Amino acid sequence: MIDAILQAVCACAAVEAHAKQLRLQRVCLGLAAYFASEQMGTSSLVGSGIEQVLTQIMTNFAGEGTTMQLSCVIINSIAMTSGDMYEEIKTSALLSALKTSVGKMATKKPEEKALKETCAATLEAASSGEDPFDAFSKTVTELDFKFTEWNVDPYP
Question: Transmembrane region positions (predicted)?
Fold first, then answer.
């Protein structure tokens, strides 16, 4: 079931029309993060092109906070799950997009610098020389649901 719903949310996010529909991208990434962090659906994700979906929202909304956290949880999780699966998503593009995006993250307010830090470890962990299981071992690998804005309406 999970495999098949994760295949839909990846497909749903990769259609070019939906690229810039943030709130959607957010919840597709949300679900992706939940299952990845919870060690499920990781094969469905990578197979159904989670790589592309990530680079899309990381270059269409470079810097955006909520998408960056979810994206990094997914990566951190997949990195801590399978060696075969991580080196499949570890594409030049993703790396470029992750660095450029970390670059543009807001860095003034106290929780804004703290969030940057988290998403910056993933980038360090990605470009590290170290075996991924070592490199990503201390990085965040669980989902705080607040970053998915699941229950926040755009027009209260």
Answer: none
Alpha-carbon torsion angle 31, 36, 42, 46, nearest 10: 70
**Residue 30 DSSP symbol:** H
- Pick from 89, 93, 87, 88: nearest CA to 56: 93
User: Buried (b) or exposed (e) across 49-74, using 16+ Cβ within 10 A?
Assistant: bbbebbbbbbeebbbbbbbbbbbbbb
Where does residue 35 rank: exposed (0-12), middle (13-18), buried (19+ CB within 10 A)? Answer: buried
Q: Give me the resolution in angstroms, 1 decimal.
A: 2.7
Instruction: Give alpha helix (H) positions in the chain.
Output: 2-14, 22-37, 42-47, 50-60, 65-79, 83-89, 92-103, 110-127, 132-135
Cα–Cα dist 45/34, whole Å: 12
Residue holding tokens 């939906």? 18
On whether the CB atoms of residues 125 and 135 are closer than 8 A, the answer is yes
- Please give the Cα distance from 150 to 156 (Å, whole number): 14
